From a paper:
Upon cognate ligand binding, NOD2 oligomerizes and recruits RIP2 via CARD-CARD interactions. Eventually, the NOD2 signalling pathway triggers an inflammatory response through NF-κB, MAPK activation and autophagy as well as the production of anti-bacterial peptides, which protect gut epithelial cells from both residual flora and pathogen invasion. Our biophysical, structural and functional data show that RIP2, via its CARD, can form helical filaments, plausibly nucleated from one end by activated NOD2.
RIP2CARD has the typical CARD fold comprising a Greek key helical bundle with the N- and C-termini oriented in the same direction and with helix H1 broken into two shorter helices: H1a and H1b.
Numbering used by the authors:
A (entry chain D): 7 to 458
B (entry chain A), D (entry chain B): 2 to 458
C (entry chain C): 2 to 457
The structure:
Amino acid sequence: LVIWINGDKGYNGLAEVGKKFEKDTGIKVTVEHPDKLEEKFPQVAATGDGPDIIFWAHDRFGGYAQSGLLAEITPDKAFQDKLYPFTWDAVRYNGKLIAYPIAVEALSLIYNKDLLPNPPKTWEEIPALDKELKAKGKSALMFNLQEPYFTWPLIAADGGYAFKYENGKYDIKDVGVDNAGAKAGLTFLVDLIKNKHMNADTDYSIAEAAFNKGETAMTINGPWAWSNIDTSAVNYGVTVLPTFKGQPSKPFVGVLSAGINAASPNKELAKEFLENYLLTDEGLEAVNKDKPLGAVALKSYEEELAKDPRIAATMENAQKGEIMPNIPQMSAFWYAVRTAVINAASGRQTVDAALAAAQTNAAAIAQQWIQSKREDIVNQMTEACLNQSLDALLSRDLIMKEDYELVSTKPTRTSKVRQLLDTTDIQGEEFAKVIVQKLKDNKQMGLQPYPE
Amino acid sequence: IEEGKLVIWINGDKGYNGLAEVGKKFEKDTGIKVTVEHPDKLEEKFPQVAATGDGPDIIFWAHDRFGGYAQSGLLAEITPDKAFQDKLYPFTWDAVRYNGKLIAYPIAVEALSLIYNKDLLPNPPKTWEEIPALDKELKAKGKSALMFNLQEPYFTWPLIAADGGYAFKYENGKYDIKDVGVDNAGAKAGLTFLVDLIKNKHMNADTDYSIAEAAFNKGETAMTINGPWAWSNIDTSAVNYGVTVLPTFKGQPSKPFVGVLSAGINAASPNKELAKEFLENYLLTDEGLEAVNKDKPLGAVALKSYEEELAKDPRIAATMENAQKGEIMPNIPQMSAFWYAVRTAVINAASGRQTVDAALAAAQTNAAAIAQQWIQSKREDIVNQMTEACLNQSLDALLSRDLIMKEDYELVSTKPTRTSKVRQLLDTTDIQGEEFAKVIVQKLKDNKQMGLQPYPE
Amino acid sequence: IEEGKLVIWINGDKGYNGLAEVGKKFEKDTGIKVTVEHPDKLEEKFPQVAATGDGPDIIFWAHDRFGGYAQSGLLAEITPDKAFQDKLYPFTWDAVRYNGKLIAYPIAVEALSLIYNKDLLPNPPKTWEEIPALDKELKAKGKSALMFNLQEPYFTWPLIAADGGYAFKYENGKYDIKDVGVDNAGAKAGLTFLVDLIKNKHMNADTDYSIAEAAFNKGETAMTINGPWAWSNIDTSAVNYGVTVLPTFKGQPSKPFVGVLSAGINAASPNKELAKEFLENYLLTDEGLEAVNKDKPLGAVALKSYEEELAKDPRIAATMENAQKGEIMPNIPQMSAFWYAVRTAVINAASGRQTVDAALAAAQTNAAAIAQQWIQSKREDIVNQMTEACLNQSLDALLSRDLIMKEDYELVSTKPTRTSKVRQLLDTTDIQGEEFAKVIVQKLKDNKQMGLQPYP
Amino acid sequence: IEEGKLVIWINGDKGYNGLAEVGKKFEKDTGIKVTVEHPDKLEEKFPQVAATGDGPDIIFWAHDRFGGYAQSGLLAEITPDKAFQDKLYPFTWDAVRYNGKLIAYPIAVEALSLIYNKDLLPNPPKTWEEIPALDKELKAKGKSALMFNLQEPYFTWPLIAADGGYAFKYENGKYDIKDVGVDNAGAKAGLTFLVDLIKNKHMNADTDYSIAEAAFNKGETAMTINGPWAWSNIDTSAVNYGVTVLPTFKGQPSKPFVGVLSAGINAASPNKELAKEFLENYLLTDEGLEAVNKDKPLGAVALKSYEEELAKDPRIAATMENAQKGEIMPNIPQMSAFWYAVRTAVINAASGRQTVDAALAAAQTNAAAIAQQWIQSKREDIVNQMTEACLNQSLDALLSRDLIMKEDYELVSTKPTRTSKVRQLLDTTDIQGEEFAKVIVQKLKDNKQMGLQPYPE
């Protein structure tokens, strides 16, 4: 068995669960923690190779499931009762369970009790608080601005959202990163950076190091981070995220899930490891001891963790927040918002411009419209429309030099358009808008209803 | 405590060496030796030591603490004859009357005044709102406008009460213990302005009494807020000064709490009749009061004959003008809780750990003291009726919220029995505040201790 | 680090807001903006950050840490002209001279003094031995005799050195790095007396700087031990106080270590010439020093012209009298090891985890730092010449004595090669202390690695 | 002062009402009215008022202060005929002889004695070393062993001198003013033992004369140390008491200083011949002395005829036995400096501000008084020769060491000229002690005032 799990989680703890599995049933386990395992998995598993079993938040899994990468798990309904019922809903894609829920996790405000005994319950008082701490040679807040997971709580607060819930399923066309609530949140984050309260290029390692050394009074982070703080022994508390414009911060709530690779031979060996070794009270605490899982999906072990007020704070944040969608659109949404946060923070773009760009990118209206009528476009695109698209795309630097030549050196106009539509999926949504414009310019009225 | 001798406890800021000379007159005349001591936190030391038995024969403090001592049975119920009651002012007797019983002898009325340096500032400000502006000008000449004790809430209260804050509402005859007004907009407005002065570098958050007096008496600041007692040290330094009315806030005047320095006799003393001779025939006389007043001013005295002289001095005229605009302290037992509730809110907001809205909201619940008094009302019932599970549930939950110290937790649990553990828990509820008490009353309601009578809400 | 601007690092207890005003004069005049920061553990943060590259342009600390920075190549070798060298005192230049090279600008000489409350105690004690008696009397009146910072060894050292303790012996010209005197009877006697005061409830084991100053400035204790910098806050509270000579122990006087607050320039800064203008022409002048001194006293300054004024003040006269009776700190790189070796011994003995004889015996070996430096002297030879058996024998024996953490052991053994494992072992020897190193040097001697040169 | 009438000054503890009756006999006979006053600090009031002119006609005090008044020209040089000199004892004349000149009339020899309660303690201790033990036993029965005036050094000196302390060494004929023995091991040993009694709760540091007499006369303590004058009040209370020899220390006996109560005439009085009639023919007679002695005992009188009767009383026999073992006070002007130097050292060591070694080392330099007398020897030269720089340097340095009060500094500097400023500085050097003088003599030597003659060392 080869297990892939994120580096910030308790991998050495999960390695000890593997050595128990090795000692008992004989099968050796290897727990690896490669970088960008969320992006490495869909590459390697699509061909065939990779890990037997993958550990990540439930949002990426429905995208893997639509791609046929994950094995459709079948735990018996006596086992389904041992885990919480809403954690199963997190890993249910089109009436099919695709991974085992391990633990619910959400972001919390983590504050230094010695530097700040009464922490702020509003974002609006943090600028003021920082000015006071600057006098004593410290800062108020410091957290990871690179990843959009951490900054999203602020963005969603006043009224931003990834995809609207249409009371039963998510509307893939109604994206809310553009709306005034979303602008207001990000504007405030940019303003903190502009007024020297925060620093635009602060990553996870900068943030944790600062708070754990006692150089800043507050950080925003999940359960996993608590392990390192205990070591440094900065007298700390975990509490509810500060409010913005009266309304509470809404962090996206992840369910750390374990899905089995569809291209693995060891499908039955993984189910023994998950159901009978990991998802047990002994197994989960071996992981939790190394680096906290959060509030676990296993009912029996959550009973103990609920007593700890840190988990009580984590669940209070998760209640006020909302659960991530598992749908395949989320991967596009995430790296669309990633850019908008980083550009606005560094000051290359404005907030209005950055989120307007991420609005179209997260939606993917053209890129999905092309995908919906894929074969029709291959058959119905004229050789003029192809060249018009190829010219206009090259004039806006949207095609690389290798990608342009790889398209045009195909034998036929049928195969060229195919190779063009292969690169539309790879090269983003602004790429697709050009082609859909040229298809509408040349009046390819055989393609069905157009976007707008 | 010792029979034969008198042991007097009085605050250090007052004229204790002057009162010591009244003792040497008593020693020379009637033979009984007198010892005047001035221990720190004598307001908090007295209810500890006198409850067991020992302590002073006679206690000198403002009248607000006395009704709390009286409800605790610590003070002797004094019986001066009605020929003597006419020698002191009638409203000063009302200050020391607890449930139709006189509990101490009124010595002097005292209230805070604006004390300004005439050389640095000949026309002092009549509004708080112009002090920020005035400070900026004095910063140019290497000085500051105002500087006073921010630690004690007595001094900062004038500003808080001005716009409409209050300790406990008067129900035209007695105080409503449930209607507390430290939370209201008037109270917020006052404290906000005090915080703003500190935030804009006009004042300094951690300024105590010794910092303030030293600064004004050396001529480093143009104004201070203080009572009569402070005038003695200012005369020595000879900073040409005047005492006047406190500045207005939002048009309305500052309302300082008015204290009546009272002398109560300890109920556990053998020398009850020896103290009454010392008070009525030696201290409360024109010779006796001026011996104290010479050392460090008493204020406007309760004795009619000696007030006649002190009324001529314009400093006392200023003190009484402030006291008129202000209002008299309640003597009720709730005040001790109110005071250290407001003490925290002022200090936290000043230092900038909490906001004003948060700090006063915390002090609102603490001053009201609903749980802490509910525990006190059914004290012995809770000792008998609390389960050993409820005890441990409370002890666990209190330790998880850092409400118990490490010494206090171990001192409770190392008691021999549950009856004694719960007793020791309820002993620390009175000491450790009101958020402490809310945990226990929650656990008593969780375990359904129906023996206990109606619950708070 | 940023070219254009100056970033100054100085300790929080000193007058940093005063030095900030010297920066605003520099900004107003020559245009270059100055930022005065005061981070915690700046003595330990500087060698980390400056070794890589970044950090402050200019560093303010006592001269003892500087020779360790200088041996590490962190400090820029300053070249003030000999017309400027005459403006400061000649012995203050000797304080900042490392191997015939001037490494920082001397700002001010500083030493500890007995600071007493005249109202509570008009005639202060001239012997340590009468303080237990004096405390019993003040306990009756609801106060204490003495109260000072027991955490830092700077403050408790005066007592330790008195009867005959010493950091490193002077061999009439240079310090003998192998002759350490924290173990000697004189040193034991001093620390024993400090422990006895704590054991008899006269002092409290976990009293830090903020506890001490607050107590004396509020008028809760009659005496404290502190430097010039503390006088500023006492004036504010206006506790009628005097500064005087430290009390004697066993007849001999207390010997405080004497610091020279020095300003060294970072070798990895682009603004080397901009700092020299700030130091020589703006800070080390009569206007500049008094702007700092007004905020929080520097002490007895190195600048001859401004010392002329400060010498008149009897507090400085008391400070210099203590400094005469004491002795000047070494600047050598061994001092950093000495200090945190004595820090532990003082705190353990005070809290009562160890005895004085045990605590100082531990600090004796640690301060000497014989194995850890011997490993460093033959570092690459040990990487090449250590057997894989000797590695595992060391790793086993170190783990059995709880000297390696669980993370550090696994990080060593998961290296690819035996060459890289030993490297990672010797990387952790520098971090993890001297008792760690004694195990490895024992195993290298057990396996007879007679290619390594003379042993200890 | 007034011509016609006599105004007598005598200490309050002595029999002043008895001496007033001798005045009414003088009034009835010769017509001149007499007024006997008893003002506080009359030892220190006399040299002030008599130096200008006014004061009493005749002064009653122990002979030690008189040679200081005589050197100051305050006392009239008396000339009793040698037929009258035989009526008083010859060694009492030596007590009042300053540089071969008789300066006052000797009235009575007085010395301290151990005065014990026979009912509480029938066999009194003959050693100081057993008093700690004796006190522990009496503490069980609710009483104390010893209690006496610790404020004045007269009473504690017996213990100090015992082992080998002394004021000024006798150089077989005159006293060596430079050889002072308050510092020596014998002196340290004595004071150490006195401090130890106070430290071990046997005695109380702040016990004055009124505390001591009241305690012994009420029967609250078993022993006191006091002179003859105190016996009058003890008889009234009728505590069955005995007077005996002072307890030994380290084997050697306690050496009390022996005073000769003397009556000197003011040099600035017009009634010099009227006082000599009052002294020789009315006071120093058998009728006159017993009128005083009846009110409050004089002691062992200087008048031979009346001592014959008083010698029969065993209390006087005990008093003389103490006086034999002790030694007679010097009359020299240095004694006034010695006394208030030792006064401080006793009080500081007793209260525990200083150690005994530190306190007596301070009093050693102060009693010797090298600078203060050097200033006095070249007083007018220093007024003329001190620069205005040296004045200000002294005034600055003296103020930095808290040696000048705030009133004294301003009173010097507000003089019109430098000649008058230095005069006012040297006026306060005599009042304010010897460490004050060392500063000025340092500054005079710093500025190189070579006009002034040889310097001290």
